[PDB]
């Protein structure tokens, strides 16, 4: 990305609906970590990287 994509976030979402998650580190055009989930219906949603439920959703996918 060329700028931050996430002005607002969700504290989590239904883990069963998640197709993929992109975790973007801070870079030259965005100073904060951004987490964008792509759902099975193709919808995209910004997630809070600091949220414990977000970190647990990633863990459940990583171990599936």
């Amino acid at each position: 990305e060329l700028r931050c994509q996430c002005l607002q976030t969700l504290q989590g979402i239904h883990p069963k609906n998640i197709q993929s998650v992109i975790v973007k580190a801070p870079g030259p055009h965005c100073a904060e970590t951004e987490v964008i989930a792509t759902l099975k219906n193709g919808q995209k949603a910004c997630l809070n990287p600091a949220s414990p439920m977000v970190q647990k959703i990633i863990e459940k996918i990583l171990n599936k």
Partner: antibody, heavy 126, light 108 residues
Framework: QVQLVQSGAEVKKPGASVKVSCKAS????????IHWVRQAPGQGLEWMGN????????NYNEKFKSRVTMTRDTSTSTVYMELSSLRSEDTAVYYC???????????????????WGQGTLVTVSS | EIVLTQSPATLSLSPGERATLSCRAS??????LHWYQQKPGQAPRLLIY???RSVSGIPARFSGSGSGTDFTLTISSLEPEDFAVYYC?????????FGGGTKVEIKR
């Protein structure tokens, strides 16, 4: 009223610091990025950086990142820009401007900056 | 960093005439190109966003178009209040960048 109200004019010596405020009213503060843009006398527009009213995380133009800090106060819907190690070339009108609304659903289609503060003149000289 | 180049630097026209202002980007900014008007002692004012989209309360005579890295602001018929400076600004990427401006002057 739907507005961005900035602090008054400033006069500084080289090497000093300046802190300008931009108070937002009449709209959902968390729905819009707030940018800082400056204009030297008789010149064009230059982006300083911006801040997320939600996370309070700022993004800076690399030209200023080492001597600029942007912060936000959720309780008063106010954003601040502190510019340090001031030089005469920083003499300009500094504006704050909002861009949005945006939600948790990202897009690559952006709005322009539709609401601007009245500007704050900062004069830097010996 | 993107460079936005506006042309012409000055446009001298009579009220009633069509004004055509150009903005060219150094590289793709997709359609994330916006146009602003600025009058002396005032902040810039948004006219058109995302190349061609209408802004609430802006008169119909302002319209925008684009193709590739080339953008155009058209004022179909100049009114006396339209003689001012116009800037294009991109926000496809950070830092935002603005063009150098086009001054629309009254020909007499």
């Amino acid at each position: 009223q739907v507005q961005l109200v900035q602090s008054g004019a400033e006069v500084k010596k080289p090497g000093a610091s300046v802190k300008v405020s931009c108070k937002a009213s009449g709209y959902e503060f968390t729905s819009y990025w707030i940018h800082w843009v400056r204009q030297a006398p008789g010149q064009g527009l230059e982006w300083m950086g911006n801040i997320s009213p939600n996370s309070g995380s700022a993004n800076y133009n690399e030209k200023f990142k080492s001597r600029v800090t942007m912060t936000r106060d959720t309780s008063t819907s106010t954003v601040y820009m502190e510019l340090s190690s001031l030089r005469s070339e920083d003499t300009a009108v500094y504006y704050c401007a909002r861009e949005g609304p945006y939600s948790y659903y990202p897009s690559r289609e952006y709005y322009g900056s539709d609401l601007w503060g009245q500007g704050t003149l900062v004069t830097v000289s010996s | 960093e993107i460079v936005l180049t506006q042309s012409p630097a000055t446009l001298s026209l009579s009220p009633g005439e069509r004004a055509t202002l150009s903005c060219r980007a150094s590289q793709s900014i997709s359609n994330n190109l916006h146009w602003y008007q600025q009058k002396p002692g005032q902040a810039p004012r948004l006219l058109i966003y995302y190349t061609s989209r209408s802004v609430s309360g802006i008169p119909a005579r302002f319209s925008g178009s684009g193709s590739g890295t080339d953008f155009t602001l058209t004022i179909s018929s100049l009114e006396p209040e339209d003689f001012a400076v116009y800037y294009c600004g991109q926000n496809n990427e950070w830092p935002e960048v603005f063009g150098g401006g086009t001054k629309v002057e009254i020909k007499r």
